[PDB]
Amino acid sequence: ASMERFLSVYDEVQAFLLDQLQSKYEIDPNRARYLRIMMDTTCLGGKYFRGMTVVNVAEGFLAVTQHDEATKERILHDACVGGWMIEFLQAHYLVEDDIMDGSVMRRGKPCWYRFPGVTTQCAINDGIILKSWTQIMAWHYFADRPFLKDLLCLFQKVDYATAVGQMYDVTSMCDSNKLDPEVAQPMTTDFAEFTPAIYKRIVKYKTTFYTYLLPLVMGLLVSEAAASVEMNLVERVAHLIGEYFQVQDDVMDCFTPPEQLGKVGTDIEDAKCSWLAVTFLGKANAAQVAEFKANYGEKDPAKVAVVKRLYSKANLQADFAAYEAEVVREVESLIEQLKVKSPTFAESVAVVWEKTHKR
């Protein structure tokens, strides 16, 4: 099974990385144990959606391409290693973002930096190591692969887009004209930058490149199948599915219970440019806008409750259903376009969409 193979490769990559630290980096057993626990705590426990997408894409191509059995195993092992590069990249982001945001919980457990024997002093460097491990994996497992350069160059571009998206995300509540390293950043009072286009820019860079584009293209690269798809369609369909995925997450941060969500949602307190805030501002009357301005971006629970009450009374379920119906049309249109060059890849995209649409 796909999952069973994916998790087995985790054991092999972990053993490789820790054994190399022993043989080449003069690590002592206690520090190797610290790093093993750090890797398990930060990389495991999620659904592995991103990593599994590489595996699923590669499985789609194996079903229709002639290969020796040893080659089928090599491609699947490459898809698992590539999937783990993305999961470790995500682990790097989550560790650093939780420190950046002062987050309390992640995957129902404390954020890594909050573990007693970790602290921010270690955790920032642990997050750096998680990303360095992605490059050590690539150079070791893909040393002789024809796709090595394309995969490293794609991974680098996606990682950079993600860091730019993090900048767009954490500065989304400030007025662009007031950004200045020398001056403490006040929260916007006009919310003029809470628009659908600005929100789409945040999401495109902060989430879509590493969550959808990267696993899909990595699946194509380990399959030596990129010159079989129209890359502009892959980009357009990744950015559409990714935006939809983030809109679902934005809704959950506010309305999904803390136990089911795994963390207490703070987008309102943090004054984030969320789908709820943008969509609310896209339909509110003057009085509702004024009430939103007087309560948004404050830690005070009474003001948070006012914002949640404005969202609930604003019937945002109607806007969400209208957005969803539109995304369904556009995603189906793009899947259809993907069938011209590759019905196999289009089917993999259909599965990725189905898995996103239902969660």
First to last CA, the chain: 22
By CB under 5 A, how many residues form the interface with Zn ion? 4
Residue of 28, 101, 332, 336 that binds Zn ion (CB under 5 A): 101
Which one of Zn ion, a second copy, none is in contact with 253 (Cβ closer than 5 to 8 A by kind)? Answer: Zn ion
Q: Which of 67, 73, 139, 340 binds a second copy (CB under 8 A)?
A: 139
Residue 249 in the binding site for Zn ion (CB under 5 A): yes
Cα–Cα distance between 159 and 181 in angstroms, integer? 24
**Selected binder of a second copy within 5, 18, 145, 168 (CB under 8 A):** 168
Query: ∠ at Cα 208 (168, 352), nearest 5°?
Result: 160
Is the CB of 152 or the CB of 284 nearer to a second copy?
152
> Considering only 127-135, 211-219, 255-263, 351-359, which stretch makes contact with a second copy by CB under 8 A?
127-135
Say which entry of a second copy, Zn ion, none residue 317 contacts (CB below 5 to 8 A, set by partner kind).
none
Among 59, 98, 193, 253, binds Zn ion (CB under 5 A): 253
* Chain center to CA of 101: 16
Of residues 31 and 67, the one with the C-beta less far from a second copy: 31
Nearest of 255, 177, 171 to residue 205 by alpha carbon:
171
Q: How far is the CB of 355 from a second copy (least distance, A)?
A: 28
- Map the footprint of a second copy across residues 257-316, applying CB under 8 A: none
| Residue of the chain from 121, 189, 260, 285 that contacts a second copy (CB under 8 A) | 121
Q: Which does 34 bind (CB under 5 to 8 A by kind): a second copy, Zn ion, none?
A: a second copy
Residue of the chain from 27, 62, 97, 164 that contacts Zn ion (CB under 5 A): 97
Q: Is 224 in the site for Zn ion (CB under 5 A)?
A: no
Q: Which is nearer to Zn ion, 12 or 97 (CB)?
A: 97
Written as one letter, the residue type at 137 is M
What residues numbered 190-219 form the site for a second copy, per CB under 8 A?
A: 201, 204-205
Residues that bind a second copy (CB under 8 A): 21, 25-28, 30-31, 33-35, 37-38, 41, 96, 99-101, 115-122, 124-125, 128-129, 132-133, 135-136, 139, 148-149, 152-153, 156, 159-161, 163-164, 166-168, 170-171, 176-185, 201, 204-205
Residue numbers in the known binding site for Zn(2+) are 97, 101, 169, 235, 249, 253, 267
